[PDB]
Amino acid sequence: ASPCQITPPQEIKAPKENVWYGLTDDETADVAKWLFGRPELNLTTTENAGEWDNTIALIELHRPNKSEAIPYLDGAPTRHAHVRLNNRATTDPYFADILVGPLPVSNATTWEPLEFPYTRKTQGQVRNVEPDGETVYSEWLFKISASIADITLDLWNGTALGLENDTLDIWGIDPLWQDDGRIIRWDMFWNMADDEFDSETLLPLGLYLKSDVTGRDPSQWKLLGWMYNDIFYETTEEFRKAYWSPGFVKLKPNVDGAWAHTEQRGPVPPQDRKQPPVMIAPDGARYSVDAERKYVTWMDFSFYIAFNRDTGLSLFDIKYKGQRVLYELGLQEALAHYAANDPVQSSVAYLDSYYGFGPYAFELLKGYDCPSYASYLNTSFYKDEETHTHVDSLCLFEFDADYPMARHSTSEFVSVTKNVYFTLRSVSTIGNYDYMFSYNFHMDGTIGVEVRASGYIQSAYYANNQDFGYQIHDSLSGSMHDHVLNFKADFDILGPNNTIELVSVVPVTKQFSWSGNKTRNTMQLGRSFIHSEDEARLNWGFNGQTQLHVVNQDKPNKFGEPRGYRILPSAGTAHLTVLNSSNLVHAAHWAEYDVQVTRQHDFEPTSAHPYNSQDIHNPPVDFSTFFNGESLNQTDLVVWLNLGMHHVPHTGDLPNTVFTTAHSGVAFTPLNYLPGDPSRETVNMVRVDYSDGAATAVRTFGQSNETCSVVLQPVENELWSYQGDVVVRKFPYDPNDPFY
Amino acid sequence: ASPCQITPPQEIKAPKENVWYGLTDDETADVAKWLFGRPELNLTTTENAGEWDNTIALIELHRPNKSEAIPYLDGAPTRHAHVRLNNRATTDPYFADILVGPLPVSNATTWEPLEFPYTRKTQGQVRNVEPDGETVYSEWLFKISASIADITLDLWNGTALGLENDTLDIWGIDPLWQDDGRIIRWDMFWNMADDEFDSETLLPLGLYLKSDVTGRDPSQWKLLGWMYNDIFYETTEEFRKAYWSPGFVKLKPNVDGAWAHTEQRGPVPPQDRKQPPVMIAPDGARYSVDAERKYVTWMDFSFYIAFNRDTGLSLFDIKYKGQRVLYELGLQEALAHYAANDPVQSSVAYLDSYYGFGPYAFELLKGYDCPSYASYLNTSFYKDEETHTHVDSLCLFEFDADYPMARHSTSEFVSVTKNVYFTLRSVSTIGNYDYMFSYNFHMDGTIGVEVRASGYIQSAYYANNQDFGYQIHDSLSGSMHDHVLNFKADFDILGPNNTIELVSVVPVTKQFSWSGNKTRNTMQLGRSFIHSEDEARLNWGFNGQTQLHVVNQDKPNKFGEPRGYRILPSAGTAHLTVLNSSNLVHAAHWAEYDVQVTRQHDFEPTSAHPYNSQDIHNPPVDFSTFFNGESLNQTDLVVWLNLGMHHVPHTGDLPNTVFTTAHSGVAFTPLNYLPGDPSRETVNMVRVDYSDGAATAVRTFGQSNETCSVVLQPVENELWSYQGDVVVRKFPYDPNDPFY
């Protein structure tokens, strides 16, 4: 009864360097040092910086153009850094995208504006619409709040003044209102959560404050009004007189309590203290990894891992049976578009790459976020002249699905194939949201992209919000919002020259050669190719009647059928409900359809830019401008896919939303691509022949007949070795003294 | 290092008798004996019977009316048998639904026609449209085939004559054509599969034969024509002259080979011979079962299992936290509606309860169809005066999902809850189809109903079928078909008096009290109740914008919000594409919408009847007739749900369709039903607090801290104990001599 051998993944070396992953620590250090030695940039370190300096917002690898990468992979691009500067030594503060290279840093190294990969052509510059993060509080919000401190005490026994005794918090909208040169704020009071709980987004208080914060001089900012209980007041005097008048309606606060906390609560059900089932890996990891080149192979699949600050995880050069199917697959942006009868919730339209997925891709809880036997990679990100490493933030694992891949029974025999699949997973927790992203690979050739949501909802005050959600607590509205997450799928099916084919199942009344002048009500296939970008923005059909295929017309199979891959919403999807959003303007045009196809260009690498929110009337990347009538008939196309959900939170979203139901996914599956089903090549299948009450034969096809043992420790033990974020200072470069 | 204790499920006793499950062996024996002792019925045993006798098609428990069951459960119905007779001692053969009772069988026992639970009111009688199964071959098809034996030899080196040397097979349509009193057949030649392979449905040959088979006298049947390569011939002479003419196009057969077989084939991928991950249950089964009353409890859930010949598995009295949410949940019928440029495939519209799900609910392969630690129940069915028991054909198991239930991270702590859920599963294999049905229960209160499909597709000959599928092999078309499977969901939310509410997310341009004469492009909730059956047949909205809730308006929560359950297509769904199908006529009106709500009646227990196919112009149950303008405002309603798929098989459906992508599901989740998320009551969650590079606290909430060991045997060992179908003769009743 020998122990099972839980062997780690195989150590292999990727055939090519990983030209996408990111900067090495040294490179990032060299570039930082170089940038500070450029007096024209006149940069200050974060530690020394305040609100009126020039600082380094980001230093990362500039990803090479596909036209550079493909000849390196198929037949080594010079590395360059992408740098972002926050220039606040000015009354017109701005963000600046630049290129620093060539690397390694040398006398030959230069910098220049970067405007190639953006649709806005402004030398990589966009305004910084929130340059006074501190001053907006100390010289404005807190002063205004002190104007009504007596009122906030009477309403909720609280104050927000900027002191230790503060029991209230003030914040509002994203993006800020950007009508006609002006920059306008709508803010709300919130109750604070108890110490060591993250429940503030469940504690709105319902008093709103409109501010014109145009310019960086607080003596020129104006108080445009207040709102409470659906009544508007132009001035503070008018609100104060109304408040203390007899008959004034005072509404209750939301106060923190067990209801808003994630701890165990309520009756423990029968037998739940016993161990639930646990997935184990008797032979360990049945895949191969290059840890240095962040490269993975599993069965017939291989791919490279990439990771940035904006969108976190990304996959490159995804191949199947030695042949590329996707040059690039990755998150592009996440939208959280709200609506409400109040101005704060009405105005929220989060574009998460502003905050970044990479910085909040924290370490996973082993055994919970992924199975215990999963292999775990690191990810890092640059901020504040520091490299932050999130230890064990990616996970990789095989998983035996609760249902088999295939089967067939008869009166004489039964056969079944197991469904063993591979998953690459990341989880980013941006403030209150927990997005869990998963990339699946299956033995039938199916690639899956999924997202699930959990964490805290961004709540809304109950008062008069009947048309925009449910009341789910004493003074709480669940509110409403659309999640829309855009993914870039650069399919290069049997080469770059591809076409989108729509294969539709549609009703027809039809006559036939055997019908005899009679007709029959039946159905038919309707086939058409998307010819141009003019007709390339579409939605999933009524009754799922239209299938969408990415094919290569120049590589048909032996039956004249173009080889390709079907894209289907396996777990359901949804695009933005709001038409011509007032919040977004031009900032998220990708959110308007489920499936969008454009011709590939190296000057259109991403569907978004992190600071689209800074200038919604003229964003760096305006996705709309990608559509200029280019041909999509056997050219290099990119399929842009939205995963998404319509979320009207109910009482079951308290304390947190659950991953079971907050779910959205698409799947890429072979379509007339192979001679047959490739899952049949697995040994992990069986055929039992049977008669007269017993099995006569059991064919197991060369799979393991191993008998072995495992000792199961409680996974919670490993939780004690949770460390979190490992910081290394990069200027001055001090890699031997990490800290937290 | 003590071994893990894999304890079986707890033995409990259900609070009430299981009034739905089925007849006991003795009852079934007593009823058979009784029926044969009724000379008015003049019945012959199957062993003695041919085509011109009266036989017993079915003996089963007549399920009691809900009006009888509810007072027994909430405050014991007399048992009656439902019997079906195949009366073929007549030139107008017919099926007869009757009631035999009361039970136990005594002098008081009687029989009578049963027409209460059918919409057709014809004393439970419907014609038998296929009474001459044997004669249709020996006196017709084989004689006609011998007429062209020389041609079938030249075309495919084969013959169908009714001999041992037969290499071809002949069969065709379901239902048979039923225009204007006549009964018409369209049949096709098929190639036979090799010995011990089930691949015939992949081997069409493309020669078609139209026959008028009206009446039971073969000398009055007529040969209406032939079809081949899209050319029609009215007579055999005309076809024979055309065939042997110079220039006649002869098209190739589909012949069996590895391509059509399910055995392992192709390159075994890297590391696949190693053991894949395996789910184990360290503490065994964390649920409770009454084996005698077929009753299950898991955590906060409980339900009764029922099982019949027509639709197989069914659930009754599904309760949550001691309160009923569904009186009944179960498969009602499965449609397989095809289309093609040929008459056989054009005419196929299978209604599977004719064949029955219960007879083909074969024993599962342990470790493959379900996890190895699953508990396995039996199911049985009556046929041919015999009780057939399918050993270990139901399975029950917990499963730790590959993703957690909920999580939330901060810079100071992380918390996660596991997603451990319960599954009840059955698999029916009707001829070539393998339907795997699964009922899921989750710790958030979510109930899931799923189907996946695998097995062999019913193929189509390639010739001239371009508009109705792909060519996927040398002479093979994948064809096309809609799967539509109807489920009855009798929600009784906090009592029988319920209402359907549609909560929709829709765009609006809106003015506000804080807007200042400006409007904003936003979105809003749109709420409406379904008032009547006139407006109760609907489809899932555009962009998933409309949520469907089953609520009780008379039991609102403390915030005025009606308590209920959301129904959502979690895994995607689809209804029948074909409008006013010529194949179906009135036989499957439930297939026409995704979601259909009717008022509950005991005289409408099922949406279908097995022999709807026998009289498509006047079926026993015509679902359309359920809709007669009855109020659905706070009355007892039934939600009828379709799971389904549009399936245009491609090359990856060879040899079999795969469960990964052939998938469809709905989910019932609490909606403003509880004060909060009930998943938080589980101990199987964790919270890690962390700082300065280490975890300061790990709260595990009273879950298992067990360290134990398991020996893992290869599951294939248990496969040798596969026995299959255990038959016991019920007339003469001989329970001590079972056989196969």
Ligand SMILES: *[C@@H]1O[C@H](CO)[C@@H](O[C@@H]2O[C@H](CO)[C@@H](O[C@@H]3O[C@H](CO)[C@@H](O)[C@H](O[C@H]4O[C@H](CO)[C@@H](O)[C@H](O)[C@@H]4O)[C@@H]3O)[C@H](O)[C@H]2NC(C)=O)[C@H](O)[C@H]1NC(C)=O
């Ligand atoms: C190289 O970088 C340095 C900074 O790293 C930069 O010096 C900074 O210049 C900014 C102005 O661009 C200074 O900010 C001002 O400081 C003064 C005095 O302390 C304040 O009074 C100013 O605020 C008032 O006036 C503003 C309008 O002019 C209003 O908008 C504002 O609300 C106030 O009323 C303003 O904050 C900053 O202090 C210096 N820092 C240092 C260390 O000198 C320098 O100019 C750059 N070099 C070049 C060549 O550009």
Ligand SMILES: *[C@@H]1O[C@H](CO)[C@@H](O[C@@H]2O[C@H](CO)[C@@H](O[C@@H]3O[C@H](CO)[C@@H](O)[C@H](O[C@H]4O[C@H](CO)[C@@H](O)[C@H](O)[C@@H]4O)[C@@H]3O)[C@H](O)[C@H]2NC(C)=O)[C@H](O)[C@H]1NC(C)=O
């Ligand atoms: C009680 O049940 C028994 C059967 O269990 C029943 O006797 C059966 O009657 C049927 C007729 O209803 C008989 O079937 C016929 O048999 C004759 C002679 O063998 C055949 O020639 C007949 O077939 C020809 O004629 C038919 C039209 O009349 C044509 O449709 C057909 O194509 C043929 O040309 C026909 O098959 C059957 O043989 C008997 N069986 C026995 C054992 O007697 C009996 O009538 C029932 N009792 C009562 C009171 O109803």
Ligand SMILES: *[C@@H]1O[C@H](CO)[C@@H](O[C@@H]2O[C@H](CO)[C@@H](O)[C@H](O)[C@H]2NC(C)=O)[C@H](O)[C@H]1NC(C)=O
């Ligand atoms: C769209 O792309 C396809 C490329 O396959 C073009 O069709 C091919 O055209 C060549 C001649 O240039 C033929 O020899 C091939 O047989 C064609 N293949 C198929 C499958 O049709 C097509 O012409 C292009 N459309 C336009 C408008 O240029």
Ligand SMILES: *[C@@H]1O[C@H](CO)[C@@H](O[C@@H]2O[C@H](CO)[C@@H](O)[C@H](O)[C@H]2NC(C)=O)[C@H](O)[C@H]1NC(C)=O
């Ligand atoms: C539809 O059903 C609801 C049952 O709740 C009816 O509304 C209730 O009517 C009673 C009076 O009969 C009131 O006292 C309740 O307050 C009502 N409740 C709600 C939530 O409105 C309603 O009248 C019925 N509709 C019709 C047309 O009869």
Ligand SMILES: *[C@@H]1O[C@H](CO)[C@@H](O)[C@H](O)[C@H]1NC(C)=O
């Ligand atoms: C905080 O202290 C200030 C100054 O004394 C006071 O005005 C305010 O009421 C205090 N806040 C609270 C919540 O008591």
Ligand SMILES: *[C@@H]1O[C@H](CO)[C@@H](O)[C@H](O)[C@H]1NC(C)=O
């Ligand atoms: C992740 O980073 C930590 C801290 O730098 C390091 O100790 C560890 O080796 C890294 N993980 C791997 C797999 O190399």
Ligand SMILES: *[C@@H]1O[C@H](CO)[C@@H](O)[C@H](O)[C@H]1NC(C)=O
């Ligand atoms: C969107 O709305 C704005 C103002 O509401 C209007 O000026 C503009 O024309 C609209 N855009 C479109 C594309 O309809």
Ligand SMILES: *[C@@H]1O[C@H](CO)[C@@H](O)[C@H](O)[C@H]1NC(C)=O
């Ligand atoms: C079967 O035997 C018959 C009678 O001899 C003959 O006509 C026919 O050709 C045989 N079938 C085949 C497939 O050879």
Ligand SMILES: *[C@@H]1O[C@H](CO)[C@@H](O)[C@H](O)[C@H]1NC(C)=O
């Ligand atoms: C299933 O039926 C078989 C054959 O009658 C019997 O031996 C076995 O005990 C049954 N299973 C259970 C769990 O009782």
Ligand SMILES: *[C@@H]1O[C@H](CO)[C@@H](O)[C@H](O)[C@H]1NC(C)=O
């Ligand atoms: C369905 O079609 C038949 C014949 O094609 C026709 O007689 C009938 O009116 C149609 N029914 C409906 C509801 O349109």
Ligand SMILES: [Ca+2]
């Ligand atoms: Ca373009």
Ligand SMILES: [Ca+2]
């Ligand atoms: Ca491409």
Ligand SMILES: [Ca+2]
């Ligand atoms: Ca009715």
Ligand SMILES: [Ca+2]
């Ligand atoms: Ca009901």
Ligand SMILES: [Cu+2]
């Ligand atoms: Cu949400």
Ligand SMILES: [Cu+2]
């Ligand atoms: Cu199918």
